[PDB]
Amino acid sequence: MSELEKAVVALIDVFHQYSGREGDKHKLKKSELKELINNELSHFLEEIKEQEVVDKVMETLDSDGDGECDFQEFMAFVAMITTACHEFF
Amino acid sequence: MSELEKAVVALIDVFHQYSGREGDKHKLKKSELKELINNELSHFLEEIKEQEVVDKVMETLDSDGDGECDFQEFMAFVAMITTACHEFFEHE
Ligand SMILES: *C1=C(SCCO)C(=O)c2ccccc2C1=O
Ligand SMILES: *C1=C(SCCO)C(=O)c2ccccc2C1=O
Ligand SMILES: [Ca+2]
Ligand SMILES: [Ca+2]
Ligand SMILES: [Ca+2]
Numbered sequence: 207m208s209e210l211e212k213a214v215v216a217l218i219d220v221f222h223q224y225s226g227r228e229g230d231k232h233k234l235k236k237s238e239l240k241e242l243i244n245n246e247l248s249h250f251l252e253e254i255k256e257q258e259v260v261d262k263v264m265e266t267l268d269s270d271g272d273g274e275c276d277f278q279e280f281m282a283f284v285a286m287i288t289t290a291c292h293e294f295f
Numbered sequence: 296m297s298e299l300e301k302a303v304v305a306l307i308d309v310f311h312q313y314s315g316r317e318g319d320k321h322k323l324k325k326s327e328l329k330e331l332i333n334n335e336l337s338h339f340l341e342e343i344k345e346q347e348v349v350d351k352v353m354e355t356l357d358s359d360g361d362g363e364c365d366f367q368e369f370m371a372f373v374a375m376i377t378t379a380c381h382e383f384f385e386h387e
């Protein structure tokens with residue numbers, strides 16, 4: 207794979223490393239989303255140490271209202287992060 | 296860096312490998328977009344050889360109509376590709 211192709215696959219893989227833990231294997235519940243952020247975005251985003259933040263992040267990401275973050279919603283999160291990083295530089 | 300953080304950085308890296316080649320250093324013109332697809336998406340998309348094909352890709356991606364693909368528009372392209380890829384496997 208090229209660098210870009212590897213990045214695409216990594217996005218899918220990381221989503222599933224977390225979505226597949228509990229409940230529906232194709233969505234991130236609050237606890238899965240928290241762990242993804244704390245373990246995999248520790249250099250980019252402040253660590254989540256409060257359940258209120260979990261609740262508010264999920265509210266922001268959960269566009270279809272099912273209480274969880276699906277792949278589409280995760281990709282919108284990735285786009286937000288990547289845009290923020292781009293602006294940073 | 297986690298794998299996710301490395302992937303994010305790779306997106307920014309690749310965009311800039313191509314956007315700074317010609318003209319506006321912050322956007323992909325058609326030639327730069329063709330080169331990006333042909334060299335970085337050679338396993339996921341058919342090689343571009345015809346003008347009409349790169350014209351159509353740019354038309355599809357160029358949400359703001361300025362004739363080039365900026366970073367936001369590139370990120371939307373990446374999301375399209377990633378979503379399509381993920382649908383080839385169990386995804387529900
Ligand atoms: C991206 C980010 S994202 C910050 C939340 O919007 C970042 O914090 C960072 C820090 C240091 C080097 C690189 C980066 C990013 O690419
Ligand atoms: C990703 C892609 S790119 C999007 C194609 O519409 C792909 O073509 C593909 C084909 C076969 C297996 C896996 C994948 C992808 O992960
Ligand atoms: Ca789950
Ligand atoms: Ca949802
Ligand atoms: Ca350019």
Ligand SMILES: [Ca+2]
Nearest residue numbers: 357359361363
């Ligand atoms: Ca544009």
